[PDB]
Amino acid sequence: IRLHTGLLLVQLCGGERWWGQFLSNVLQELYNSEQLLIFPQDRVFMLLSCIGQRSLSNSGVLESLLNLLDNLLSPLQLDIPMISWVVMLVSRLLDYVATVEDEANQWSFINNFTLAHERCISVVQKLVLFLLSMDFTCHADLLLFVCKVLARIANATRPTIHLCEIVNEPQLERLLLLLVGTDFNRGDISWGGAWAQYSLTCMLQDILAGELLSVSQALDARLEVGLEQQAELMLKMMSTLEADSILQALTNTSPLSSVPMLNVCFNKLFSMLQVHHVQLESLLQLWLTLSLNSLYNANRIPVISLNQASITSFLTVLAWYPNTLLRTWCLVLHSLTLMTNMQLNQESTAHLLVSDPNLIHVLVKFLSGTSPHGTNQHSPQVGPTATQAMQEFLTRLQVHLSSTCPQIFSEFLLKLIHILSTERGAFQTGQGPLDAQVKLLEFTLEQNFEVVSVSTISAVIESVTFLVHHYITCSDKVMSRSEMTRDQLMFDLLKLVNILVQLPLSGPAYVADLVLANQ
Amino acid sequence: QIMSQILSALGLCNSSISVGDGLFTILTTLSKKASTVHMMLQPILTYMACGTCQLSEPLLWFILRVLDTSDALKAFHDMGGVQLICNNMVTSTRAIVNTARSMVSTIMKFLDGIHNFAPLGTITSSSPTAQPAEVLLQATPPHRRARSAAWSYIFLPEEAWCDLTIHLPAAVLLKEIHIQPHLASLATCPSSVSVEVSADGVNMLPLSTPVVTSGLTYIKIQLVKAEVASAVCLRLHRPRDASTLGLSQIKLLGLTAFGEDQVSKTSIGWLRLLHHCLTHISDLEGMMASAAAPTANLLQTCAALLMSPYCGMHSPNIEVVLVKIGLQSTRIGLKLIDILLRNSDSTIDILYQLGTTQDPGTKDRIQALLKWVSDSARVAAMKTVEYGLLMPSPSHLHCVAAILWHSYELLVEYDLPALLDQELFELLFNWSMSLPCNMVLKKAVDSLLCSMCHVHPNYFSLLMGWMGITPLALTESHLATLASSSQSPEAIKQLLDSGLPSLLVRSLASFCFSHISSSESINKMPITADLVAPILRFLTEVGNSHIMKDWLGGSEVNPLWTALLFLLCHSGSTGLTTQQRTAIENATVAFFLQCISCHPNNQKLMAQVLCELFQTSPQGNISGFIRRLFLQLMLEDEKVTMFLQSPCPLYVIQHPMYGAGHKFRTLHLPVSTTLSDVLDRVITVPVFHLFHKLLAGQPLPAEMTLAQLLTLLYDRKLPQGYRSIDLTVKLGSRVISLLETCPIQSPLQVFAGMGGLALIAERL
Incomplete structure (x- = not known):
């Protein structure tokens, strides 16, 4: 009878001008913490949800x-239950609004019009004030839920x-600082758990994106004797049409960019x-997600513009800190593609970032594949x-600075080659990513080496020749048979040195004379 | 540096042969071979300050171990560790937000234990396959013979892996991934698998180096940190020796958003440390608690975490340290009383200890309590900080009553009667008369009335002087107050001395006689049919005293019994309404249950009365009252009230003599059960032993039943009808006459002795 009176009243008084105020009143005085009833x-509350759904x-x-x-959280210029039910209720209302809009997915982890601007601003900032003052007396689920409704209303206004x-x-x-620092985000009890951080990221990306746009027909046969069969059949047909009327009645319804200060804040965070x-890892992953939403692509321009101090701090803290997992290495590489x-x-940013040797050191750490925590060092x-x-990444670097100076980058890459093949290097011992090595070397083959200094080419050729000679002469005593392997890598290096020796010598002399002189 | 390394390792290790075990043992030996505590606590405190500080349970255990000696605590206080830990309390309590499943999760639970999620997702691959891999996604495809494969892939020679992207409809908290190769022919099993996840479903990223899988019958990838993933790409590398894949089934084990170590790292580790500080030695705790007292917001945070559900396992330490700090100083004690009343069971127990422990501040505490209760009751009677005064918890009021009663019983140092003035009696009377009888707060205030009048018999005498007691018309609230306040011995003595019960019995009997005469014909004051059931109920509560029961079995009360029986059986339907008939019949049920309870003289007298009325039964239909009385009165097993006391914890509004808290227990149970049952509901090994105040050093047997025990008390000078039997519980030591006494005869057998069964069978 509750549902029935609700449906009658929504089909009669649903359109009333006092209906919203009446609803607000009855919701206030039924659920009060002082209400002892x-x-x-x-x-009755889900029924209230259903009638509000009809009354939308x-x-x-x-x-x-x-x-x-607005009148509710005025003491926050706290009764948690009032807020909890009302925000979940409005969340349901907004979910049905969103599904109606969609049929005519970021929130899918829960389901298994025009508004005055100023008052919306007031209620959202009061909500933010409520967010920043969360102790043990409040819990994480209500927080994530209020964040989600916040995102929905923000998109709604x-x-x-x-x-x-x-x-x-x-x-x-x-x-x-609450979101990213390792004074509040230490261990498994990171704020509200993973679901909470994911939702926080979700709301942040949506707000920035918004800123940047019958019955059986049977009857008793034995009654045919009397003449009153028509009475029962007319009663039956009135009753069934009425039943149809009731189902129809039930089914039918009732007819100024923040980017500069944001950059300042990130610079403060890097400092x-x-x-x-x-x-570092949480910061970088969140940053790349916030910059990427504008599918991953190297041609996607990140919305967030960084600082020189940011990159210098980033490189020095990574160079100092060792043993970064492959997950964070791929994340770092993605972030470097984006920068x-x-x-x-x-002067270009790529030239500056390449110039200092901490980049040399990080790339060496990446390509050496030591993995000191690897109980399963099978395939590096x-x-x-x-x-x-x-x-x-390398293609982006080459295509961006080839116009200005590829020669200095060529000298850097040869320095990387020398250090990766020097005494106690990664290449000789065989550790490190083989596929990455063959891809870098083959990409290196396509570069032009016109004005490279003679000293570094001589150093790299001597080093590689010594290493490969000691490898071939001291080759293994067995070989097993049953695809790319390190044999192709040596083949590719010798192809590269062949490319190197074919170059005329800069003041048509060639470098073949120079490699001849060192006996 | 080394100390920093090892302490950081302890702050980053797990709970329970392990590396953490090894470090714990070596640090233990380091403490064992150390000379003085100063150089061992120095790296420790540099680590807490430098760290905030990373604390794990082995580290907590070590801090407990290194603080075993008294000198350890003394040095901790000497070099200012307590101020730093209190600072840690402020920072930790202010820092971390509660993550426990609140009301919101409960209400969200019904709006729609490791769960498989494989069927729900959709699969795809970067190459067109001749067959789709959804057969792997089924919850359980038939795996009994495994002829060729459930699903297969063919590798081109130029390619060495195949990527299988599973898109789940929604992100889930993945727990574990299991992959089943074709068990019959696992030569096609992939050499290595590289799993990639996507929380957002687009940013696809690797998790670790491809784990080798060749020659594995069961593929298990344990995920240490459970991951919220919406899309997974499985890059399966080429088998060592085959160009084909054999796969049997893929299952997706995980949790949805709403489907010990999580609490220890929080403030409760230092809370247990504080508990050790304040409780391991009760002699050095004073001045260091004084030093640990003035730290900011200690009481507020402590109370807030006590109100939190996380205290359920370790609440005792919380209220013990709270009690100790409150007793240590008066002003902070009053302040914490205010914050616990103005700004649960544990609060009741806090008030119980605060009232009960004897100290110079006890008078100030009870003065503050009387001010609080007067303010709260005044606020309630006239209609932020006042909120605690709007609804004072009735359990707390009963606790105050119990404290007052027990303070009267115990030989207190102060003069407790001096603090109870007549103005308080008048105020309490106005408070009681201000509200009706349906709610329990009136019951609580009249329990307070009973306790204080027990303290002050002259105050009870004054109470008689208000309602025309030295015609008479008394409202139901008057009956409730008199019944509740008369339970004490002095009050029942003055009630007996006053002629009020005699006059109301005579007037009620006259009314019953008049009603019988009116039915059969179809200073005196009358009683209407409305109030007869409440006044009979009033008789039921006042009949709890044994001397009252003895007085009830005299000739002065038998005319009421005979008149009521005649009225409610012979006078068939001044007209009895059915609802009032039910009310008065239930009142007679309770009254006759109370009369025959543990009173052998009354038992045999009522047996005589029942034989008399059955012999004079009309000659032949059984009336409803006689039928129901037969069904009820002598078919119920005799029930007696047991009261238990114990210094140990044992796991409602009652009379203040029963005390409060869970340390004092009170139940009303049938005598057929034994002591083993009542102990069940609650090598040298401590064993619970029952004792009695009358019994000088003999434990009570577990299989020793209560009817026999009641006979033993009656044989050892106990007044007839004493309803509550007190039993104290002690802890004896066990290394791994009473039963032979006659049980009670019971009213049923007493009645059946002289052959009432033949009479009722004839009347049947």
């Missing part, structure tokens, strides 16, 4: 409820709200990860996806 809050056609309901919210009018520098700073107060796609605001390959990303 015992009633099935769950069933009326516009005043949403305004009245957010007005109740026309025009979409921007972060400049939402937070200032201290609030954003507090948000980033604070030096004191080992922030985990290579970036320009800086006039990093996998084709990472190698292909590395190929795109």
